[PDB]
Symmetry: C3
Subunit: 284 residues, 3 copies
């Protein structure tokens, strides 16, 4: 079910191709194996079911390998990691690698504590990843940026040096790096894009971020190029979030949480075509 829905030889990734990927997810209901934190497991599964994917949440070493093996994508999230779950994630990642299943990493809290930073780095050393998604700090810490340089994230900033961090990190780890923010910056070794969808209410719902990473997994299962897959996923998810906000921006974060799930099921190819904002960043 992993086809090719866009190529740079036909132009830059756009809203049209993004909408096509969304259709593919619905059509194939890809199995997405998520080994995520226990604060967002339920929401992750429901978000994927709403979208149209098939969530599988096995996490024990007694079954992760055989499950990742037959999944369309594997998503690892270290939100409430333990020595045991990090080992299970790596066992799962190695099985996925052996069977050509794309693996996505969400380094939640990388940099907050040493254990998280080192676990993220252990996963990257032992597992070939198709994409990594996190905020600027988590990515910086995960890829090994020097301590004192990290400061270049605080204060008011959301466009510029983040573009370089994303491409440079993608080149060092030969993967796709998605740096989350109001404006998302995504890049692989040779290409960079900025994404402008979503709504601030997402910051008031736990798992909103974790769900997106798993959503990226759903798209990588149906689109061969993870850069295109991730752009289509983030765009579709953001459009759904905007439509959800429209109907529940005044009710509150509780209603929005529910509305996000509603919209992931009702968002259409036409909505993505009309609202997705994807911009190619010139790199030369």
């Amino acid at each position: 079910m992993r086809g090719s829905h866009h190529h740079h030889h036909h132009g830059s990734m756009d809203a049209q191709s993004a909408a096509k990927c969304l259709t593919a997810v619905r059509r194939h209901s890809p199995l997405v194996h998520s080994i995520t934190n226990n604060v967002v497991t339920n929401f992750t599964a429901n978000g994927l079911l709403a979208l149209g994917a098939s969530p599988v949440m096995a996490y024990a070493k007694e079954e992760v390998a055989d499950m990742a093996k037959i999944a369309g994508a594997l998503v690892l999230n270290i939100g409430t990691l333990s020595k045991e779950s990090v080992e299970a994630m790596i066992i799962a990642g190695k099985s996925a690698n052996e069977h050509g299943v794309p693996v996505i990493l969400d380094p939640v809290g990388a940099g907050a504590t040493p254990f998280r930073t080192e676990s993220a780095r252990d996963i990257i050393r032992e597992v070939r990843l198709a994409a990594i998604r996190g905020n600027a700090a988590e990515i910086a810490h995960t890829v090994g940026v020097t301590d004192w340089l990290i400061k270049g994230v605080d204060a008011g900033e959301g466009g510029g040096d983040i573009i370089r961090l994303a491409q440079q990190a993608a080149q060092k780890l030969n993967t796709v790096i998605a740096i989350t923010g109001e404006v998302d910056v995504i890049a692989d070794t040779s290409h960079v894009y900025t994404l402008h969808n979503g709504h601030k209410l997402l910051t008031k719902v736990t798992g909103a971020g974790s769900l997106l990473t798993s959503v990226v997994g759903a798209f990588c299962a149906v689109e061969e190029n993870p850069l295109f897959a991730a752009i289509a996923a983030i765009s579709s998810y953001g459009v759904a979030a905007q439509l959800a906000a429209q109907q529940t921006a005044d009710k509150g974060p509780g209603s929005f949480q529910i509305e996000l799930l509603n919209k992931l099921s009702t968002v259409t190819e036409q909505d993505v075509q009309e609202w997705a904002t994807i911009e190619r960043v010139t790199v030369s």
Copy 2:
């Protein structure tokens, strides 16, 4: 406490008797000890609270034996299982048996992987069960396939094959077998019933089946005959789902999830009497 809301010497189980069991559940607020997967613990607990029961989710070896012995019913779900949790489920199950607390099993995943099938079998070997609720495949592979034939040209269920599977499984394991699906077939060693309630939206909410098994548990806690208890529980849950689907309309799976919780609390004896579709299967 426990009681008898119906007897076969007293006609076939019906909507009226089902409605009475529902009232009994709310009147007694039975302690339902559910050991389930981390993807549905919250939804399971909320569903039970909405219904009118008192959930307890202890899962650790250090306390499951103590919690199970004072509960009205013990429910075991094998999702996202591990060697560790299976052992705890057995300790809990034996404690429940020693104190006359009914145990209900949900063999989710049985037949899909060896660890699940063996774990389900391990529980059956060590714990006496009041009922087992799962889909056709999970029940067939758990019990072991002895009858293969069903119907030529794959299309649907059949019209008697699932009915045979249930009664034979019930006779082999000497328990109540509830095969769930768009038709629900419940049977014990000498009686079989088909249930026709519910709504497709349930497939879009994680923990749907998980919760249903626990609801069966709540009903087993107040009705002596597990066959009647399961019928009443499944009928009540299904009617609530139908009402929730009607209120939800086209809002989406998020709204339906919240509505199912709402309806598990607002569904009345009258709604059950009016909408529960229970049919006793004639077996000459």
Copy 3:
């Protein structure tokens, strides 16, 4: 960030001062580290996010010390514990203690089973607590090493004996004791208050109590006087629950769960001033 919004000498805690504490919480978005169970993690995090605080869940012994020391408050919940998590809670508590991070304990289930009771006692023995939030029974069973330790009179419901219960516990443990119920009783070594807000629907939402305890943590992070912090936290939460129940009307606990999240976000400083019912108990 533990500042003072009410200097104790100008008068007792009131609805006006409690309201200002709420604004302080939203102004600082305190990092609340919660070590709790998967049945209530998601609601606890979403509730804190709605309120205006920043939730972080970390349980691994490899990182709890590091996470607790940078948190604004540490909250320990023994809900569905394991020998492993209790070990981690104590490690985190000791770290918090060495760095002046307030620690709040929710002794859920203490007394209902042996392991839970003992685990509650080990924590209090090894960790200095800023406050303990539980019901009359849990508080009694947790402080009552002997069956005579707690003196007074036994009867239905309770409150006065509850007042003496709270003072005895506060002085014995040298902390703030928050005994929740229809009417809340809160006391430290010198003062006692009764709070009259909230709604019965809270008993129909799993994680309602767990969330309240973590909310107390959020207020303790910004208000230096733990007694005042607990009062402001419980009052804000209760008022939000009242507005939520009104908004819900008679839809059901599903809608209430969502509306409670909405209101924790939309409840204003003015709402607390108007609805908060705080009464200083005259101790002669």
